[PDB]
C-alpha cells in the first residue's frame, strides 16, 4: 500500500469537486451530512442505470442535483413516469428545493467508474477473470482514450490463495499532474467474498 488516489490529487488542478457550494461552520457539518444521504439513496437505486458523477451545486437552500448516467431512460421510465417518483423522494429527505436533472454518459468506456463497474459486475458474473480485464482495457483504446489500465484484486476465480492481476496500455502517467486521469473504484461480491477493482484512464495533457 504505497501510492495515491489520482482524483484526490488534482483537486482543482485538472479535475473538480462534485459537491460545489459554499458553507459556514454551522452549515457545512449538516449541509454535507445531507449530500451523503442524497448520494446514498440516489446510488442504491440508480445502479442498473449506470450512474457516474453526481454534482450537488448549492445556493440559498436550493439544492442542484445533476446526474451523469449511462442509461438516462432507466432514470426516466416511460414518458417522465419514474423520475418524478424520486425528484420528491429527495425533497422528502432534504425538506427543500431538489432540482434533480439528467445527463447521459455519452461515451461509456471513456468514463472510469462505469468501466470499473461492468468489470466488477463481470466478476460477480462468474466470467473469465483475465479476459474480463483485457477486453476491459481493450475497449478503452478502442473508444479512443490516451491510456488504459484495470486492476482486478481479490481471491480471484474462486481461489483460496488471494492474489491480484491486471494489464494496461498507452500513457498511464500519474506523476504528471497535467495529465487528466479518472479513477474507478468498483467492488464485486462473490460467494467467496469481496473483490475491489480499479480502472484508470488517461484522456489528455492540457
Amino acid at each position: 500500500g504505497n501510492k495515491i488516489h489520482p482524483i484526490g490529487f488534482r483537486l482543482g488542478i485538472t479535475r473538480d469537486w462534485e459537491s460545489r457550494w459554499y458553507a459556514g461552520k454551522k452549515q457545512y457539518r449538516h449541509l454535507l451530512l445531507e449530500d451523503q444521504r442524497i448520494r446514498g439513496l440516489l446510488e442504491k437505486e440508480l445502479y442498473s442505470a449506470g450512474l457516474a458523477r453526481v454534482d450537488i451545486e448549492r445556493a440559498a437552500d436550493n439544492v442542484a442535483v445533476t446526474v451523469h448516467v449511462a442509461k438516462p431512460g432507466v432514470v426516466i421510465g416511460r414518458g417522465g413516469e419514474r423520475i418524478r417518483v424520486l425528484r420528491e423522494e429527495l425533497a422528502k429527505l432534504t425538506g427543500k428545493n431538489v432540482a434533480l436533472n439528467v445527463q447521459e454518459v455519452q461515451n461509456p468506456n471513456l468514463s472510469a467508474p462505469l468501466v470499473a463497474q461492468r468489470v466488477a459486475e463481470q466478476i460477480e458474473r462468474r466470467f473469465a477473470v483475465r479476459r474480463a480485464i483485457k477486453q476491459a482495457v481493450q475497449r478503452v483504446m478502442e473508444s479512443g482514450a490516451k491510456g488504459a489500465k484495470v486492476i482486478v484484486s481479490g481471491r480471484i476465480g474462486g481461489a483460496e490463495q488471494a492474489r491480484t492481476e491486471w494489464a494496461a496500455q498507452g500513457r498511464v502517467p500519474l506523476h504528471t499532474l497535467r495529465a487528466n486521469i479518472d479513477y474507478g473504484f468498483a467492488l464485486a461480491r462473490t460467494t467467496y467474498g469481496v473483490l475491489g477493482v480499479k480502472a484508470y484512464i488517461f484522456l489528455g495533457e492540457v
Binding site: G12, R20, W21, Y22, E57, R58, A59, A64
Partner: protein, 99 residues
C-alpha cells in the same frame, strides 16, 4: 455607499463572480473603488494516512476561505436592479452592506 462581501471556495469563480458585478456598476451609473483582495483564512487538517498503527505518515488538507469586497460609490436606480439581474456564480455566497 453599497458594499458587497463575497465569501467562497475557488479563487476562480470568486474572481469571476466579482468581475461581472464590477462591470454593471460602471455602465449602470456608478464610479467604483475596484475589486478588493482580502485577508484569506486557512483551516487545515492534518491526518493519519493509516487505518491503524502507522502514525508518523500523515496527509495534508487546506480549506481556503476567500474574501472579496467591492464598494459602489453613487448607486443609481439605473444600477441596483442591474446587479440583481447579473447574479449567476454557483459556489459563491454574496452579501450586501450599506453605511
Amino acid at each position: 455607499k453599497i458594499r458587497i462581501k463575497l465569501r467562497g471556495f475557488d479563487h476562480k469563480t470568486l474572481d469571476a463572480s466579482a468581475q461581472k458585478i464590477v462591470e454593471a456598476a460602471r455602465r449602470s451609473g456608478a464610479q467604483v473603488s475596484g475589486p478588493i483582495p482580502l485577508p484569506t483564512r486557512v483551516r487545515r487538517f492534518t491526518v493519519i494516512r493509516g487505518p491503524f498503527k502507522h502514525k508518523d505518515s500523515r496527509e495534508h488538507f487546506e480549506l481556503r476561505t476567500h474574501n472579496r469586497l467591492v464598494d459602489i460609490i453613487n448607486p443609481n436606480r439605473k444600477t441596483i436592479e442591474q446587479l440583481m439581474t447579473l447574479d449567476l456564480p454557483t459556489g459563491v455566497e454574496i452579501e450586501i452592506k450599506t453605511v
